[PDB]
Design a binder for this molecule. Structure first.
Ligand SMILES: Fc1ccc(Cn2cnc3ccccc32)cc1
Length: 282
């Protein structure tokens, strides 16, 4: 079926939970043996969210190459994304090592450091120009260059330096600051505006390594971001935009990381975002 009318048909029939459970039943199951080794227990935020072995990002380190992060490679859309958990106190250095080694231009953050009175990820970037951060375990230096605070999101320019080689690179930090502590946004308008700002920067484009995107577990809000982006790109590329099937795209993405889209409300919000976004594109 088309999307917008499939949408109203699920609303009128109130069957979002049944649709979402079908997706969960059909989703791929692949091994995640490296994630479950005992030496990696303090590298995982949640015991039930792990990268598959076949698609995990490997750190270029011979001691321990493990990080909780996955490469989502979308062949028809010609887009790649790295989805990862919010860094932990003992993985902030690994996180920036991955950004360096994978040649990423942008980092997309969809959570606040504290939500619901608890810490959802480490404070992993510097908050003042004159107070830089040094990660001694991976030999990197990170400096805040500039910060632009808007009503729904903040964009930061950062300098990442590899202290071994003295090479430097400019990284863009796109921080969506207004996702609610509970539920999903009422309108997709500010989320779509944010996605378009990431696109305009070049961070999603083939001349760079894959964008790094995260929330707390790296599957819920993070899944909504890449699902909407890929669906809109396919609607531009195909002769028949109504052929784009958001459930099929989501199942394709779940071949590469488990659990993408965590609730039926996130599924409905993803439909809404793609529907509204397709009208603005034209
Ligand atoms: F991936 C995308 C492709 C195009 C747009 C177009 N757009 C830009 N700003 C918007 C605000 C509200 C609604 C739509 C919008 C967005 C995302």
């Amino acid at each position: 079926m088309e999307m917008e009318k499939e949408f109203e048909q699920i609303d009128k029939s109130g069957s979002w939970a049944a649709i979402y459970q079908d997706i969960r039943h059909e989703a791929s199951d692949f091994p995640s043996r490296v994630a479950k080794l005992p030496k990696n227990k303090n590298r995982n935020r949640y015991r039930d969210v792990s990268p598959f072995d076949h698609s995990r990002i490997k750190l270029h380190q011979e001691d321990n190459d493990y990080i909780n992060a996955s490469l989502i490679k979308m062949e028809e859309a010609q887009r790649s994304y790295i989805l990862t958990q919010g860094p932990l106190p003992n993985t902030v250095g690994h996180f920036w090592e991955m950004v360096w080694e994978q040649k990423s231009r942008g980092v997309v953050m969809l959570n606040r450091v504290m939500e619901k009175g608890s810490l959802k990820c480490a404070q992993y970037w510097p908050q003042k120009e004159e107070k830089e951060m040094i990660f001694e375990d991976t030999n990197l230096k990170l400096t805040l260059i500039s910060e632009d605070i808007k009503s729904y999101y903040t964009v930061r320019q950062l300098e990442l330096e590899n202290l071994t080689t003295q090479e430097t690179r400019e990284i863009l930090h796109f921080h969506y600051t207004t996702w609610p502590d509970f539920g999903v946004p009422e309108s997709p308008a500010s989320f779509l505006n944010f996605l378009f700002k990431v696109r305009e920067s070049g961070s999603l484009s083939p001349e760079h390594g894959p964008v790094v995107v995260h929330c707390s577990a790296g599957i819920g809000r993070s899944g909504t971001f890449c699902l909407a982006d890929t669906c809109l790109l396919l609607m531009d590329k195909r002769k028949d935009p109504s052929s784009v099937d958001i459930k099929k795209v989501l199942l394709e993405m779940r071949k590469f990381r488990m659990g993408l889209i965590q609730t039926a409300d996130q599924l409905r919000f993803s439909y809404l975002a793609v529907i509204e976004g397709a009208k603005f594109i034209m």
